[PDB]
Scaffold this active site. Structure first.
Site, PDB file in Angstrom:
ATOM      1  CE1 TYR A 218      -6.231   4.659  -1.881  1.00  0.00           C
ATOM      2  CE2 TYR A 218      -4.601   3.932  -0.240  1.00  0.00           C
ATOM      3  CZ  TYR A 218      -5.868   3.864  -0.798  1.00  0.00           C
ATOM      4  OH  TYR A 218      -6.750   2.968  -0.278  1.00  0.00           O
TER       5      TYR A 218
ATOM      6  CB  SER B 217      -0.845   0.032   1.269  1.00  0.00           C
ATOM      7  OG  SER B 217      -1.415   1.319   1.457  1.00  0.00           O
TER       8      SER B 217
HETATM    9  C1  FMN Z   1      -7.156  -2.364   7.501  1.00  0.00           C
HETATM   10  C2  FMN Z   1      -7.474  -1.993   6.058  1.00  0.00           C
HETATM   11  C3  FMN Z   1      -6.608  -1.151   5.363  1.00  0.00           C
HETATM   12  C4  FMN Z   1      -6.670  -1.104   3.971  1.00  0.00           C
HETATM   13  N1  FMN Z   1      -5.825  -0.280   3.273  1.00  0.00           N
HETATM   14  C5  FMN Z   1      -5.850  -0.246   1.899  1.00  0.00           C
HETATM   15  C6  FMN Z   1      -4.935   0.544   1.204  1.00  0.00           C
HETATM   16  O1  FMN Z   1      -4.034   1.184   1.807  1.00  0.00           O
HETATM   17  N2  FMN Z   1      -4.995   0.556  -0.174  1.00  0.00           N
HETATM   18  C7  FMN Z   1      -5.969  -0.168  -0.866  1.00  0.00           C
HETATM   19  O2  FMN Z   1      -6.026  -0.163  -2.111  1.00  0.00           O
HETATM   20  N3  FMN Z   1      -6.849  -0.964  -0.152  1.00  0.00           N
HETATM   21  C8  FMN Z   1      -6.796  -1.006   1.212  1.00  0.00           C
HETATM   22  N4  FMN Z   1      -7.696  -1.801   1.891  1.00  0.00           N
HETATM   23  C9  FMN Z   1      -8.674  -2.611   1.092  1.00  0.00           C
HETATM   24  C10 FMN Z   1      -8.078  -3.992   0.889  1.00  0.00           C
HETATM   25  O3  FMN Z   1      -7.168  -3.916  -0.186  1.00  0.00           O
HETATM   26  C11 FMN Z   1      -9.149  -5.000   0.476  1.00  0.00           C
HETATM   27  O4  FMN Z   1      -9.947  -4.490  -0.593  1.00  0.00           O
HETATM   28  C12 FMN Z   1     -10.036  -5.455   1.631  1.00  0.00           C
HETATM   29  O5  FMN Z   1      -9.215  -5.788   2.741  1.00  0.00           O
HETATM   30  C13 FMN Z   1     -10.843  -6.680   1.198  1.00  0.00           C
HETATM   31  O6  FMN Z   1     -11.800  -6.878   2.208  1.00  0.00           O
HETATM   32  P1  FMN Z   1     -11.580  -8.019   3.327  1.00  0.00           P
HETATM   33  O7  FMN Z   1     -10.318  -7.801   4.122  1.00  0.00           O
HETATM   34  O8  FMN Z   1     -12.715  -7.822   4.273  1.00  0.00           O
HETATM   35  O9  FMN Z   1     -11.683  -9.439   2.753  1.00  0.00           O
HETATM   36  C14 FMN Z   1      -7.631  -1.873   3.278  1.00  0.00           C
HETATM   37  C15 FMN Z   1      -8.481  -2.716   4.009  1.00  0.00           C
HETATM   38  C16 FMN Z   1      -8.418  -2.772   5.375  1.00  0.00           C
HETATM   39  C17 FMN Z   1      -8.914  -4.061   6.017  1.00  0.00           C
END
Ligand code: FMN
Ligand code: FMN
Ligand code: FMN
Ligand code: FMN
Lengths: 374, 374, 374, 374
Positions: free
Chosen positions: C146, C122
C-alpha cells in the site's frame, strides 16, 4: 339443501365485502369454507408450481404508465359474440359452487347478471338450469360441456342448454383425465352433493364420488370431429377451452370453433406446464383475428385484464377470486369481486392512457427478462 | 440375534404403500432407516446444489397440454435391446440395498420383475447373483460393473454376470474417485455388510469400509480401451454410464458401446456441475440415433419420464424413489413406486395427446428461460 | 499476544482441523475470534450482495464430469514466475492476522511455507519482516505494497521487502479509499495493535486507528506512472491487484506490470459490482497470454480452482478460508485448509479428466444462463 | 397546533443522526412516526413488487472498480438549468413532510439549502410558503404542480410559484388517479394537513381539496396542450415528471417541456410496471441531449447516483430516505442524509476513477443478465 346436503356446511351469509385485493380473499375464505371443499377450490396439480407460474407470468410483461394521453373517464364496456357487457371479463365455468356457498351457482349467477356480464354454466353444476335461471333473471349465459362417451347424452345436454337460453357452448377439452391434485388426494376429497345436469351418465350420483371418477366417466377420445359435431348439432358458437399450444387453436378453428379459450384450467390439470399468460401471444398470433379469444388462468388484478387484452385476448374469464367472494358474501360477495375488477381496471386504464377497451388492445408492454425475482 | 449383523437395523416390514408423489417418500423413509444409511442414500456432493439442479432442470422445458388429440387409453409399453418392458423406465443400478431393507436386492428384484421391467445389478450389491436371481424369478437383468484393476478379475465378474443371465453390461465410469459427500463424511459412513461380487479385489471384505476406499480399489485409469475390451470379452451390449458431455457419447460409441447412459450419478459425484436433464439434448443430438439412450438423475414424476423421451432418451432409470419405497414396504413398497410411475405417466400421456411411447418422443416442449422462480 | 493489543483476546491454540468444507469454517471461527475482529475479517461492503455475488458466480459456469479419460493420479503441481509450487494456489495478501490468532502472520507463513506455496505479505501486517521470515524459513514470498504518498518512503519499503527476500511486488490499487463496510462502521472497528511496515507514514500507530484513516494515509492518486516506477525501482516482477475491467489489465501491462491480479478485494471495496469470477474471462481474453494472471475473491472449493484455471487464471489466491483456519488452529489449522484445497482439487481433476494442471486449463465449462436458483 | 389540521403526533426533536446506510432508516423511523402516516410514506401500490423492482433494478447494471486512474479528491459539484449545486441530487417534490416531522417541508428546506442543492416544493405542501421560505433562507427552489381542471386555477398557482421565486415548474402527470396503495386502504389512513400554499386558488372540483382527494379533484384529461400552455404561461422551464416510456419524453419535449423527469412516483402509482432505473437508458437515448433529465424512484446509495449518471440522468432526486431522516432528527436528520449521500458518492467516484461529476457520466457498467439472485 335438497337430496344432497349432509354434514357439509357451506357459508350462507349474504353481504357485500371490502376487496382491497383478490389475493387476501383466499386466506379469508379458508376461514369460512369446510377444509375438503376449500382445498378442492384453492388447490392445483403437483406441488402447485404451475399455479404459481400462472401468477408470476404477469411479471414477464410490465405496463408503462403513459402521460398527457388526453383520457378521462375510461369506459370498460365491450362486446363479444353479440353480447354487450359492462367490462371485458366474464365468469369462467366452475363446477364448485355449492362447495363455496349454499346459494350455489344461483348466487354467482345473480352477481354476474346484476353486474352486467356473461355467466358460464359448468356441466358439473350442483344447481339445475332452472335454479341458475332464477338467479340470472334473463341475463346472458354460455354452457360448458364435459362430453359423455354416449353421443345421445351429448345431444340431450346441448338441447337442454340451448332450451335454457345458452348463446354459446364451451367445449372443455383439457380434462380427459384428472390432474394430479395432491390436496384432494391427501384429503380423500369427495363431492358432498349431486350434479343434476350430467347425472344421466354417472353410475349413481356424483355425491359419493371423486373427481377422478367423474372425469373418466366423461369422453377421453375427444377428436376434431367432436368440435365439428357440437357446432353442427347445437345452433351455437363453440369455444374450445384449455388451449395452450397454437397448433390446437389452428386445429379448433379449422374444425368449426367460433372462439378459442386460452386456459390451463387454473393449473388444476397438466403439471409442469407453462404459466397460462406466457402462452397467450403465440396463440393470438396464430389465431390472427379469425375468431375471438377468451383468456383465463391466473387473473387477479385489473393490470392482468389489461395485459391479456394487450396480448390478444378479447375478454378474460374470472374464477377463484369470484368463488372466494361467493364464500364470503353469497351473491353480494361475488358481486363485490366483479365490482373490484371493474374499478381496478378503470384505474389501470386511466394510468395507461386507455380511454376504452379497444385502446387497451394497442398497449405496448415492457419485456422483463429477469422474471419474478427481478 | 441375526449372526450376519453387528448392529445395523434396516426395516423389514413388507407392504404396499399409497404414493401421492415420490418427494414425500424421502422424509417418510427417514423415519425407518438408520441415520447413517439413510443419509448415504439421500445425500449428494457438496451442499447438494447439483442435486437441486437435477430437480429444477425439469422446469426449463415445460409440457403443453394438447386437446382433441385422438387419444384414449395410452399404452406405456416399449422395447429396448430386445426386452419388451411394461413402461419406458428400468431400475438404476444402486449399491447395498440392505441399507434400505433387510430383503435387500432380492426385494428390489422382486418388485422390478413382477412389475415387468429390467433390473440393473450394482457390482456393489450386498447380495449375491444367486440371491438376486431368486428375487427376479427369470426376469430380465443387466449387470453394472465397477471394474477391477486386474483384467482377469473383470473377465471373471463378466463371466459370472453373463452366466447369471445378464443381457447387457453397464460400465459406470463417473466414479473413479468418490464425490465430496459431506453427509457421509460428517456421519463417518461405513458399510455395515460385505459386497460379494467385488470382494475379490478388496483387501478386506467391505463391512467396515468407506465408499472412498471401495471406489479406488476399483479402476481409476479407465480409458476407451476398457470399453472395447469389455464389449469384446462379454459379447453383450455395453452401456457407458455417467455421460454428461456429448464428446464422451461419441467416443464411447466409436469405442464399441451399444448404448449411452446419461447420468450424473444422482449428483453424488462431481459437484457444481449441470442438472443432468439439461445435458440430455446435446448428447442426444450428437448420438443421432446410433445407439439407444438411457437417461437418469432426478426423475420423480411421470412428467419427467415424458420430457426425457421427448428430449431423446429411449427409457429413463429410477433410483432414490424406488429405494425409499423399498425402505418403507420391501418388495411391495418398491412395487408401489413403480406402479405410481406407470400411472403417473399414463395421465401425462393422456393430457399431452400421446397414445403410445413413440408419440411421447415427438412432443414439442415449451422453453422456459425464466428459471425455477419464473 | 504482542506488545500492541488494546485488550484483544485472539485464539492461541495450535491444532490440525477436520475440514469438510471451507464454508463451515466461518461460523466455527466466529465462536473463538473476538466480535469486532471477526466481523472485520468476515464482512464486506454494503449489505454484502457483491460478496454473495462472488460466491454465486461459480454457478454461472459448471464443470462437466468426463469419462474414460486416461487419468489416474492427478498432479496438482505448477510453476509461476520461476516458483515451483505444490498446487495452483498462493496465499492472498491479508492485513489481519493477529485479529485471527496470536501467532499472527508468522503462523500463516509457517503453514504456507510447509505446504509448499507462496506467501503474500500485506503492507498492513501486524508483524515485522523478521517475524514473518522466521515463520517462512526461507520459503518464497511476495510483498504487497500500500503505497506511501512520499516516493522515498516507497523506495525504503520496497528495499526492505526485497532485502527480506520478496521475489515479486503486488501493487494493490483498488483501495485508494475504504469500501463501505457496514459491520465495521456499526462495530466502530479500530485495530487493537500496530502495523510496523507502514508506521513511517501513519505519523503514529495503526493501533486505535480506523481502516478509513489508514487507507487515507496511503496514496490516493495512483496512476500508471506508479506501476512503471515500482517496477523500475525494485528488481522485481510487479502485479497490479484489484483489476475487474479488461482496459485496466491492458493499461497495467503497457505500464510495465509483469502480472495481472484479478480481484475485487473479497468484496470489501466497491459495492454493487460484479462477482469477481464473472469478470475473469474478459480480462483473460484481453491479456491474451502476455503476463500471468492470479485470480481471487470467492475461492472456496477445488471446483472453483478448476474453473478459474479453465477460464484463464494461472493460479488462484486464497484468503478468508485460510484465516478462518488460522483462528481455529494456528499454523496447523491454516495448513489443514491448504491441504483441504489440495485434496479437493485432486478429486476434481480426476472427475474432469485432468492429469495435471495444464489439462485443467483446457477444460470446457457448461454455461448456466439460469441463475443460482436454476 | 393549527386548529384547522387533524391532530397528528409527528416527531419534533432536532438532531444530527448517524447514517450507516439509508435502508436502516426506514425501520428506525417506524419507531417514532405514527403508524398510519409512517405507512403512507413507506408503502406502495399493490403488494409493492414494483417498489422492490425499483430497488433491485440497480443490480442489473454493476459498477467496475477502476485503478491507476490518477484521481484524488473527487468533486461532487454540478449544474442544472443554471443552478450550481453541491452534489448531483436534488430534493424530490413531496407534499407530505409533516407526516415525518412537525417542522414539515420547512424542515427539509432548511436541510436542503444548508447542504447546497435544490428544494422541490409541492404546491400541496403542509407548510406555508413563508414557513418554507424561512427554511430556505434564499436557497434555490422549484415548484411542483398537478394540472387543475380549472384553467384559471393553473394560472394563479403558477404566478404564485413564480412570485415565490421558483426557477422551474415540475408538472407531475403520472397521478391522474391514485395508485392502489394497499397499506393506506387497510389502515384507513386519512391525511391530516391542509394546503396553505394553494388554498385560496382552489376552484370548482378543487374546492375543499386535500391530499386525500387530490388526483380525482385535479385534471384527468391532461393532453400535450396542457404542457404547451403551462410552459407558455409560466416564464419558466417545465419538467414533465412521471415519464417511464420514451415516446412520452419525445412528446413532452415537442410540446415545450424544458426537462424530462424520469419517475414512477416511488412506486406509489401504476402497479406491475418496471423498476424505474430499467426505463432510464431508453428514455435518455430518445431524449438524446435535447433537455436535462432528472431521475428518481429507488435512489438509496451513492452507487445509485453514479449508475443513474452513467445511464443518462443529469441529477437524481431523493425522497423517502430524506423523510426518514427528517422523522429521526428534523432538518439536522434530513441534512445527515444529504451529507451521507455526498460522502457515499465521493467514495464511489474515487473507486470508479471519477474525478468529477462529468467523469461519472462516461462510466461503462457491467451488464448482469442474472437477476438479483445472481
Ligand atoms: C481480512 C481481510 C484483509 C485483507 N487485507 C488485504 C491487504 O492488506 N492487502 C490486499 O491487497 N488485500 C487484502 N485483502 C484482500 C485479499 O487479498 C483477497 O483479495 C480476498 O481475501 C479474496 O477474497 P476471499 O478471501 O473472500 O476469497 C484482505 C481481505 C480480507 C479477507
Ligand atoms: C373450483 C374449480 C372448479 C372448476 N371447474 C371447472 C369446470 O367445471 N369446467 C371447466 O371448464 N373449468 C373448470 N374450472 C377451470 C376454470 O374455468 C378456469 O379455467 C380457472 O378457474 C382459471 O383459473 P383461476 O381461477 O386461478 O384464475 C374450475 C376451476 C376451479 C377453481
Ligand atoms: C443410494 C445410491 C446408490 C447408488 N449406487 C450405484 C452403483 O452401485 N452403481 C452405479 O452405477 N450407480 C449407482 N447409483 C447411481 C444410480 O445408478 C443413478 O444414477 C441415480 O440414482 C439417479 O439419480 P436419482 O436416484 O436421484 O434419480 C447410486 C445412487 C444412489 C441413490
Ligand atoms: C409519501 C410520498 C408522497 C409523495 N408526494 C408527491 C407529490 O406530492 N408530488 C410529486 O410530484 N411526487 C410525490 N411523491 C413522489 C416523489 O416525488 C418521488 O418520485 C419518490 O419519492 C421517489 O421514490 P423514492 O422516494 O422511493 O426514491 C411522493 C412520494 C412519497 C414517498
Amino acid at each position: 339443501m335438497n337430496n344432497n346436503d349432509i354434514e357439509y356446511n357451506a357459508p350462507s351469509e349474504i353481504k357485500y365485502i371490502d376487496v382491497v385485493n383478490t389475493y387476501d380473499l383466499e386466506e379469508e375464505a379458508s376461514k369460512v369454507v369446510p377444509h375438503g371443499g376449500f382445498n378442492y377450490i384453492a388447490g392445483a396439480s403437483g406441488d402447485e408450481w404451475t399455479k404459481r407460474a400462472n401468477d408470476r407470468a404477469w411479471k414477464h410483461k410490465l405496463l408503462y404508465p403513459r402521460l398527457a394521453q388526453d383520457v378521462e373517464a375510461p369506459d370498460t364496456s365491450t362486446e363479444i359474440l353479440g353480447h354487450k357487457i359492462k367490462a371485458p371479463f366474464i365468469m369462467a365455468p366452475i363446477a364448485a359452487h355449492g362447495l363455496a356457498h349454499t346459494t350455489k351457482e344461483a348466487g354467482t349467477a345473480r352477481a354476474v347478471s346484476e353486474f352486467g356480464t356473461i355467466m358460464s354454466i359448468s356441466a358439473y353444476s350442483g344447481a339445475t338450469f332452472e335454479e341458475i335461471s332464477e338467479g340470472l333473471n334473463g341475463g346472458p349465459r354460455w354452457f360448458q360441456i364435459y362430453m359423455a362417451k354416449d353421443d345421445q347424452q351429448n345431444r340431450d345436454i346441448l338441447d337442454e342448454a340451448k332450451s335454457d337460453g345458452a348463446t354459446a357452448i364451451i367445449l372443455t377439452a383439457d380434462s380427459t383425465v384428472s390432474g394430479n391434485r395432491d390436496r384432494d388426494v391427501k384429503n380423500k376429497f369427495v363431492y358432498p352433493f349431486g350434479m343434476p345436469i350430467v347425472q344421466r351418465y354417472l353410475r349413481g350420483t356424483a355425491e359419493g364420488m371423486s373427481l377422478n371418477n367423474i372425469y373418466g366417466a366423461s369422453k377421453q377420445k375427444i377428436s376434431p370431429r367432436d368440435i365439428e359435431e357440437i357446432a353442427g348439432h347445437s345452433g351455437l358458437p363453440v369455444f374450445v377451452k384449455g388451449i395452450q399450444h397454437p397448433e390446437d387453436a389452428d386445429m379448433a378453428i379449422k374444425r368449426g370453433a367460433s372462439g378459442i379459450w386460452v386456459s390451463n384450467h387454473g393449473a388444476r390439470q397438466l403439471y409442469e406446464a407453462p404459466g397460462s399468460f406466457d402462452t397467450l401471444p403465440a396463440i393470438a398470433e396464430r389465431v390472427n383475428k379469425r375468431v375471438p379469444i377468451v383468456f383465463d388462468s391466473g387473473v387477479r388484478r385489473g393490470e392482468h385484464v389489461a395485459k391479456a387484452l394487450a396480448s390478444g385476448a378479447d375478454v378474460v374469464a374470472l374464477g377463484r377470486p369470484v368463488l372466494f367472494g361467493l364464500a364470503l358474501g353469497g351473491w353480494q360477495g361475488a358481486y363485490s369481486v366483479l365490482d373490484y375488477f371493474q374499478k381496478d381496471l378503470t384505474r389501470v386504464m386511466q394510468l395507461t392512457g386507455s380511454q376504452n377497451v379497444e385502446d387497451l388492445k394497442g398497449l405496448d408492454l415492457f419485456d422483463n427478462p429477469y422474471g419474478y425475482e427481478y
